Amino acid sequence: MSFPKGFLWGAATASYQIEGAWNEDGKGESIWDRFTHQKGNILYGHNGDVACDHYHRHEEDVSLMKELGIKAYRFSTAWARIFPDGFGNINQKGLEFYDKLINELVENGIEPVVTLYHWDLPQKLQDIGGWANPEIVNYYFEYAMLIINRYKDKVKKWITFNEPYCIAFLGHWHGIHAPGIKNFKVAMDVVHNIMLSHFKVVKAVKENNIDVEIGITLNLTPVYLQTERLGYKVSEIEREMVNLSSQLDNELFLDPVLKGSYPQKLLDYLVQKDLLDSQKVNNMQQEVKENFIFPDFLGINYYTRSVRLYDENSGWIFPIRWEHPAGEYTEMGWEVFPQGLFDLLIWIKESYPQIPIYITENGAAYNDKVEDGRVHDQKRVEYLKQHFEAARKAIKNGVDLRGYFVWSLIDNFEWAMGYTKRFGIIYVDYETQKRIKKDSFYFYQQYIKENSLE
Amino acid sequence: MSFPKGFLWGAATASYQIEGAWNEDGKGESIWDRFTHQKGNILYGHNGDVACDHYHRHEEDVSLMKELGIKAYRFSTAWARIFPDGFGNINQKGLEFYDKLINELVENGIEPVVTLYHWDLPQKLQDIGGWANPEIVNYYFEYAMLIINRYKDKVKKWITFNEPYCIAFLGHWHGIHAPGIKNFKVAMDVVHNIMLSHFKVVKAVKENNIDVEIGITLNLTPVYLQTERLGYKVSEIEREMVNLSSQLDNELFLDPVLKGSYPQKLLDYLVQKDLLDSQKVNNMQQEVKENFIFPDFLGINYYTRSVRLYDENSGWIFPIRWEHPAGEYTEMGWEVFPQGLFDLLIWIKESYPQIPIYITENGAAYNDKVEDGRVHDQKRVEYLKQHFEAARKAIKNGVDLRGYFVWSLIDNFEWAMGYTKRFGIIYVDYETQKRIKKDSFYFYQQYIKENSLE
């Protein structure tokens, strides 16, 4: 046993992934609804208009959490349900739905780790700008406060954001996620606004002496060297050039968390390549350093490592390349490697002051097949075992890791992949919405039950 | 025990991979030398100037074949060594080197399956046009004849070409291989010239009643459906559109082997997309139908399958998609699957009349690490086991397969990958040129010794 007291084992879901009911109860569409309605955005023309009927079968879903036995359930209060506009007028129907969900989560002893945002931004908020517009810093704020003041008696740990790297780069640079923007300056602006909102919420909680714990959740990609894997000798330029891409993937977000300033060298490199403005980076520095406040917790979402060997022959905006080491892979194409997470579990310890660190999302996707009314995924089980050990052996070695949340609960709308990629540990037959507990669901249940003490 | 009598088990090498000596003995550089000298063509700026000293240690290499116990050794007589120009004046020094190699191969009972071309085109031949210029059809011809008439007493099975798909598309369309051309019309021209040379050699052999057997080696990518893997129902447009890409990867070369024509569907599609000329395709059809003659043998180089689900959102010139199923992968990034080959072994049986079929190249690349003066690759062994069974179970089911050649013999210049990817079953320490017999070398030795009778 290495996991400490209060080690928040859990499962994570996103509202738009399972909810549906995009127009019911006066609720306006999400960003994902508008993104998915447009052609060329999702495989096979999918959208979360219906999803898995999480609204109508919320009793069934809470029974699912009860069966899973997760000490905490990481869910996002769908912003658009509670606020169809996103602010101002508040819908008592969506408020009542989330009141019922939260009270029946509390009644069974499940700690609500409410992620105030898990990609389910209301459409009107996207029309006013999304996460690039600095006004959202207040809106989110008040929204969070209205949730917090409503549920501070029952919800104790709040997650400000989920994967600002994915919100900002997959969602706003690569465009595979909603709302499908493809820009790097907009991505940096999203980073700025997300960090400002996180610290504004932290400051507001601290000022009013609210007895809650507030932090931010990131996804961090470790680095391994193929040259060291090759058995050869690493050159200086190799590290000197892997550093920039690693800063893009690792340091760009952790530096404002505790240091309160952006990595200056990356901003200078972007300016020299005309990808970003020096006056803008200085203004971002000034705003961050004025608005910075040390948070309470940090969240980590680890999936895979990025094996990086030095070369100039990619043509990418950062002249490096990626390697494909031999090994097990998933339907998402991700290499399965535990030890990469270990790197982060030490690296953030070395580079930054003491910030409590949480893991909030980790899992693997596999093409599930119905067999005897059941689906089988042993590769998901093996992935989870490996990433369980990667943190257990670590916390034996003096790691301040705080909790691990498994992704996901039920097979559900996996964003641009549509329904083709299934991450959840519960099979849902889309025809009947029947719930079958996979071997991975049983494995997670057994792990939580066996490890966590009384 | 399904492999028939005369199943030509073997190992394959390419001259430029192991030879070096690009300027010795009056020998001019190859196409690969000029391709590699240019920057931006090879990882880490590598070239086959020195390679593994196959020229000076040819006795050591023949001892390697003797140790491996291959019934046949698939090697390419380096065209540039024998003809520094590529034709005309013939160098007696390169002739004597290959005479010594061939006599010491015959002395130990090794059948020389001489691949007349395995990407080692002389540089002057590239300057006059490479495989696009139709004149090579004669040059190759006479070169082959000069080899054939020189070695008809000792070399009985001759391979005209190795992987026209790779010569024409990897070498002349993608540009990763030498000479690094990137064009599709040039690729079709290479297809035309290679097939014409193959049939011209076959006709010349048949006319003069030479006691030899002449064929061609292809590399063919079978197809599997993710929709069927998904458990769903396949739509008509899915098959109708996967057909075109499957024709390009498979039919463009198989169809002229026995039918003596081109797939008209793909030519019409390219014309409608303005990627190819209708007058040119008609002229190609007329020339092929004039010059076509049925060969003796067909060669197959199978590595992996191409999982294809239908969509228009890949951006390729063929609106299909590639899928990443969960499973074992190699350093080359190739999915490991036996059964795809089996699928291929049936298709040619059904789509075309009976032609004897050979497999002449198959293997997997892994990052070998020196440990106790030795390297270990168990994934290569497992890959080979799986692809051995894929054909053994097939030939139990009435397959016309004739022989299988394992790639490769010793780790060597793996083209654009440089020396980073090691395919061979013998570890060669590039510093010392010492030879260590891997577990994969031992596995292939055991397989050949056990399966073949006596």
mmCIF file with all atom_site columns, C-alpha atoms in Angstrom, chain A residues 40-44 226-232 238 309-311 313 321 323-334 365-369 379 417 419-422, chain B residues 40-44 226-232 238 309-311 313 321 323-334 365-369 379 417 419-422:
data_model
loop_
_atom_site.group_PDB
_atom_site.id
_atom_site.type_symbol
_atom_site.label_atom_id
_atom_site.label_alt_id
_atom_site.label_comp_id
_atom_site.label_asym_id
_atom_site.label_entity_id
_atom_site.label_seq_id
_atom_site.pdbx_PDB_ins_code
_atom_site.Cartn_x
_atom_site.Cartn_y
_atom_site.Cartn_z
_atom_site.occupancy
_atom_site.B_iso_or_equiv
_atom_site.pdbx_formal_charge
_atom_site.auth_seq_id
_atom_site.auth_comp_id
_atom_site.auth_asym_id
_atom_site.auth_atom_id
_atom_site.pdbx_PDB_model_num
ATOM 1  C CA . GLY A 1 40  ? -16.313 17.632 -42.048 1.00 0.00 ? 40  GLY A CA 1
ATOM 2  C CA . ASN A 1 41  ? -16.003 17.686 -38.244 1.00 0.00 ? 41  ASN A CA 1
ATOM 3  C CA . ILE A 1 42  ? -16.936 14.181 -37.021 1.00 0.00 ? 42  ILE A CA 1
ATOM 4  C CA . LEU A 1 43  ? -16.554 10.736 -38.540 1.00 0.00 ? 43  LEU A CA 1
ATOM 5  C CA . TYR A 1 44  ? -19.807 9.321  -39.942 1.00 0.00 ? 44  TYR A CA 1
ATOM 6  C CA . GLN A 1 226 ? 15.196  7.106  -28.830 1.00 0.00 ? 226 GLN A CA 1
ATOM 7  C CA . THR A 1 227 ? 18.942  7.805  -28.918 1.00 0.00 ? 227 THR A CA 1
ATOM 8  C CA . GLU A 1 228 ? 19.207  6.463  -25.368 1.00 0.00 ? 228 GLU A CA 1
ATOM 9  C CA . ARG A 1 229 ? 16.862  3.666  -26.442 1.00 0.00 ? 229 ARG A CA 1
ATOM 10 C CA . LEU A 1 230 ? 19.202  3.119  -29.407 1.00 0.00 ? 230 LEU A CA 1
ATOM 11 C CA . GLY A 1 231 ? 22.160  2.685  -27.039 1.00 0.00 ? 231 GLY A CA 1
ATOM 12 C CA . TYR A 1 232 ? 24.107  5.507  -28.693 1.00 0.00 ? 232 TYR A CA 1
ATOM 13 C CA . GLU A 1 238 ? 19.477  16.979 -29.498 1.00 0.00 ? 238 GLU A CA 1
ATOM 14 C CA . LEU A 1 309 ? 14.705  12.060 -31.618 1.00 0.00 ? 309 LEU A CA 1
ATOM 15 C CA . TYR A 1 310 ? 16.368  15.096 -33.148 1.00 0.00 ? 310 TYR A CA 1
ATOM 16 C CA . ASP A 1 311 ? 16.014  15.853 -36.867 1.00 0.00 ? 311 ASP A CA 1
ATOM 17 C CA . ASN A 1 313 ? 13.367  16.760 -41.778 1.00 0.00 ? 313 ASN A CA 1
ATOM 18 C CA . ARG A 1 321 ? 10.301  14.198 -35.179 1.00 0.00 ? 321 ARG A CA 1
ATOM 19 C CA . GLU A 1 323 ? 9.369   7.788  -33.210 1.00 0.00 ? 323 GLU A CA 1
ATOM 20 C CA . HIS A 1 324 ? 7.226   4.651  -33.306 1.00 0.00 ? 324 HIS A CA 1
ATOM 21 C CA . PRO A 1 325 ? 8.800   2.214  -30.822 1.00 0.00 ? 325 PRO A CA 1
ATOM 22 C CA . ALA A 1 326 ? 7.657   -1.387 -30.995 1.00 0.00 ? 326 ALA A CA 1
ATOM 23 C CA . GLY A 1 327 ? 4.931   -2.247 -28.523 1.00 0.00 ? 327 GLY A CA 1
ATOM 24 C CA . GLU A 1 328 ? 1.244   -2.432 -27.748 1.00 0.00 ? 328 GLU A CA 1
ATOM 25 C CA . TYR A 1 329 ? -1.011  0.296  -29.142 1.00 0.00 ? 329 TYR A CA 1
ATOM 26 C CA . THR A 1 330 ? -4.705  1.175  -28.873 1.00 0.00 ? 330 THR A CA 1
ATOM 27 C CA . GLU A 1 331 ? -7.462  2.106  -31.316 1.00 0.00 ? 331 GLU A CA 1
ATOM 28 C CA . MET A 1 332 ? -6.508  5.737  -30.666 1.00 0.00 ? 332 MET A CA 1
ATOM 29 C CA . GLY A 1 333 ? -2.962  4.904  -31.804 1.00 0.00 ? 333 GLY A CA 1
ATOM 30 C CA . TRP A 1 334 ? -1.370  5.716  -28.439 1.00 0.00 ? 334 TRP A CA 1
ATOM 31 C CA . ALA A 1 365 ? -9.998  2.889  -26.337 1.00 0.00 ? 365 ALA A CA 1
ATOM 32 C CA . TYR A 1 366 ? -10.791 -0.454 -27.960 1.00 0.00 ? 366 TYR A CA 1
ATOM 33 C CA . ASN A 1 367 ? -13.249 -1.561 -30.646 1.00 0.00 ? 367 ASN A CA 1
ATOM 34 C CA . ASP A 1 368 ? -15.732 -3.442 -28.481 1.00 0.00 ? 368 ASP A CA 1
ATOM 35 C CA . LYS A 1 369 ? -17.730 -6.275 -30.049 1.00 0.00 ? 369 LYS A CA 1
ATOM 36 C CA . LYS A 1 379 ? -6.201  -4.609 -23.416 1.00 0.00 ? 379 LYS A CA 1
ATOM 37 C CA . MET A 1 417 ? -14.163 9.668  -33.178 1.00 0.00 ? 417 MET A CA 1
ATOM 38 C CA . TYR A 1 419 ? -19.189 6.258  -31.334 1.00 0.00 ? 419 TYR A CA 1
ATOM 39 C CA . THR A 1 420 ? -16.438 4.237  -33.047 1.00 0.00 ? 420 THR A CA 1
ATOM 40 C CA . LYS A 1 421 ? -13.968 4.584  -30.153 1.00 0.00 ? 421 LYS A CA 1
ATOM 41 C CA . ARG A 1 422 ? -15.325 3.297  -26.841 1.00 0.00 ? 422 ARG A CA 1
ATOM 42 C CA . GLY B 1 40  ? 17.130  16.045 -46.684 1.00 0.00 ? 40  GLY B CA 1
ATOM 43 C CA . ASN B 1 41  ? 16.961  12.497 -48.091 1.00 0.00 ? 41  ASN B CA 1
ATOM 44 C CA . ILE B 1 42  ? 18.230  10.219 -45.293 1.00 0.00 ? 42  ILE B CA 1
ATOM 45 C CA . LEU B 1 43  ? 17.945  10.454 -41.522 1.00 0.00 ? 43  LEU B CA 1
ATOM 46 C CA . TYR B 1 44  ? 21.184  11.658 -39.898 1.00 0.00 ? 44  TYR B CA 1
ATOM 47 C CA . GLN B 1 226 ? -12.898 -1.988 -39.694 1.00 0.00 ? 226 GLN B CA 1
ATOM 48 C CA . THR B 1 227 ? -16.676 -1.858 -40.191 1.00 0.00 ? 227 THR B CA 1
ATOM 49 C CA . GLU B 1 228 ? -16.754 -5.658 -40.039 1.00 0.00 ? 228 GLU B CA 1
ATOM 50 C CA . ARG B 1 229 ? -14.335 -5.408 -37.110 1.00 0.00 ? 229 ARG B CA 1
ATOM 51 C CA . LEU B 1 230 ? -16.773 -2.874 -35.624 1.00 0.00 ? 230 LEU B CA 1
ATOM 52 C CA . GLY B 1 231 ? -19.600 -5.426 -35.844 1.00 0.00 ? 231 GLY B CA 1
ATOM 53 C CA . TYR B 1 232 ? -21.772 -3.087 -37.919 1.00 0.00 ? 232 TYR B CA 1
ATOM 54 C CA . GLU B 1 238 ? -17.862 1.612  -48.592 1.00 0.00 ? 238 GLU B CA 1
ATOM 55 C CA . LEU B 1 309 ? -12.983 2.288  -43.295 1.00 0.00 ? 309 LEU B CA 1
ATOM 56 C CA . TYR B 1 310 ? -14.848 4.556  -45.690 1.00 0.00 ? 310 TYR B CA 1
ATOM 57 C CA . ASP B 1 311 ? -14.798 8.338  -45.230 1.00 0.00 ? 311 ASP B CA 1
ATOM 58 C CA . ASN B 1 313 ? -12.068 13.216 -44.389 1.00 0.00 ? 313 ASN B CA 1
ATOM 59 C CA . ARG B 1 321 ? -9.178  6.210  -44.304 1.00 0.00 ? 321 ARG B CA 1
ATOM 60 C CA . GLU B 1 323 ? -7.330  2.701  -39.035 1.00 0.00 ? 323 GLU B CA 1
ATOM 61 C CA . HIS B 1 324 ? -5.007  1.899  -36.140 1.00 0.00 ? 324 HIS B CA 1
ATOM 62 C CA . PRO B 1 325 ? -6.301  -1.352 -34.608 1.00 0.00 ? 325 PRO B CA 1
ATOM 63 C CA . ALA B 1 326 ? -4.933  -2.289 -31.208 1.00 0.00 ? 326 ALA B CA 1
ATOM 64 C CA . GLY B 1 327 ? -2.024  -4.695 -31.398 1.00 0.00 ? 327 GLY B CA 1
ATOM 65 C CA . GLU B 1 328 ? 1.701   -5.214 -31.677 1.00 0.00 ? 328 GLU B CA 1
ATOM 66 C CA . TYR B 1 329 ? 3.678   -2.842 -33.896 1.00 0.00 ? 329 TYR B CA 1
ATOM 67 C CA . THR B 1 330 ? 7.308   -2.571 -35.012 1.00 0.00 ? 330 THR B CA 1
ATOM 68 C CA . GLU B 1 331 ? 9.880   0.219  -35.182 1.00 0.00 ? 331 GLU B CA 1
ATOM 69 C CA . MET B 1 332 ? 8.710   0.735  -38.773 1.00 0.00 ? 332 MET B CA 1
ATOM 70 C CA . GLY B 1 333 ? 5.181   1.305  -37.439 1.00 0.00 ? 333 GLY B CA 1
ATOM 71 C CA . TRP B 1 334 ? 3.695   -1.697 -39.254 1.00 0.00 ? 334 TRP B CA 1
ATOM 72 C CA . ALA B 1 365 ? 12.565  -4.065 -37.706 1.00 0.00 ? 365 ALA B CA 1
ATOM 73 C CA . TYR B 1 366 ? 13.477  -3.633 -34.043 1.00 0.00 ? 366 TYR B CA 1
ATOM 74 C CA . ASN B 1 367 ? 15.896  -1.370 -32.168 1.00 0.00 ? 367 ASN B CA 1
ATOM 75 C CA . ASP B 1 368 ? 18.641  -3.835 -31.279 1.00 0.00 ? 368 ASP B CA 1
ATOM 76 C CA . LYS B 1 369 ? 20.688  -3.152 -28.147 1.00 0.00 ? 369 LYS B CA 1
ATOM 77 C CA . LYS B 1 379 ? 9.430   -9.496 -31.427 1.00 0.00 ? 379 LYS B CA 1
ATOM 78 C CA . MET B 1 417 ? 15.831  4.870  -42.129 1.00 0.00 ? 417 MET B CA 1
ATOM 79 C CA . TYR B 1 419 ? 21.273  2.341  -39.920 1.00 0.00 ? 419 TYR B CA 1
ATOM 80 C CA . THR B 1 420 ? 18.776  3.132  -37.135 1.00 0.00 ? 420 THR B CA 1
ATOM 81 C CA . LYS B 1 421 ? 16.348  0.393  -38.224 1.00 0.00 ? 421 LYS B CA 1
ATOM 82 C CA . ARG B 1 422 ? 17.892  -3.083 -38.131 1.00 0.00 ? 422 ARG B CA 1
#
